[PDB]
Amino acid sequence: NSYNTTNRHNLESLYKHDSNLIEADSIKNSPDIVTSHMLKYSVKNLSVFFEKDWISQEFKDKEVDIYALSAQERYEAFGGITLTNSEKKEIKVPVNVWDKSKQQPPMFITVNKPKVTAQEVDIKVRKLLIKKYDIYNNREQKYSKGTVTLDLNSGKDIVFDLYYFGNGDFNSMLKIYSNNERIDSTQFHVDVSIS
């Protein structure tokens, strides 16, 4: 179940420690020989994998911003790439937490990219829930069910299960971001439900 101590401990470690996070700005890829589903960066060697073959052609040789979680293979990330942008103006994405039926005070996370990946949003939200609610705690294990829903104004929701452990490995838990899906920073808000 979602009470498996190791999976809760791994899922937490991945999202809790910044040592697992790769955040680089205005970086360009290495002119190496790669497949149709990847790109290589020098941030440590990074293999950024994408779901479809056309997603990489978009960033090839262009300066991009990276914000993705990684796992030692040296390292491999899934998506987390957006073309660089000068407009680094702060944006407060509204986060609405429902802690055990109870509505909580208005909370926010910040992004300074006009377009941010679904992954960057998820990561920042989980760091928030880990710190305030300690949703992956293995001592008391008060939480075991939860979701992170990005409610877009375009009539579409992007949901993340807070307790998806994949097959147990970091790459399995991160492959969910392979779509390198992006969204307009001021055109959505976040709804979190933890119980």
Swiss-Prot record:
- The answer to whether the entry has keyword Disulfide bond is no
Subcellular localization, per the record?
Answer: Secreted
List, alphabetically, the InterPro entries matched: Enterotoxin, Staph/Strept_toxin_CS, Staph_tox_OB, SuperAg_toxin_C, Superantigen_bac, Toxin_b-grasp_Staph/Strep
* Keywords, in A-Z order: Secreted, Signal, Toxin, Virulence
Could you name the Gene Ontology cellular component terms for this entry?
A: extracellular region
Q: What is its main location?
A: secreted
Secreted as a keyword of this entry, yes or no, is yes
SUPFAM superfamilies with a match to the protein in the record: Bacterial enterotoxins, Superantigen toxins, C-terminal domain
| Pfam families documented for this protein | Stap_Strp_tox_C, Stap_Strp_toxin
Family designation:
Belongs to the staphylococcal/streptococcal toxin family.
- Role: Mitogenic for human peripheral blood lymphocytes.
Misc. comment: Binds to major histocompatibility complex class II beta chain.
Q: What is this protein called?
A: Exotoxin type H
Gene name per UniProt: speH
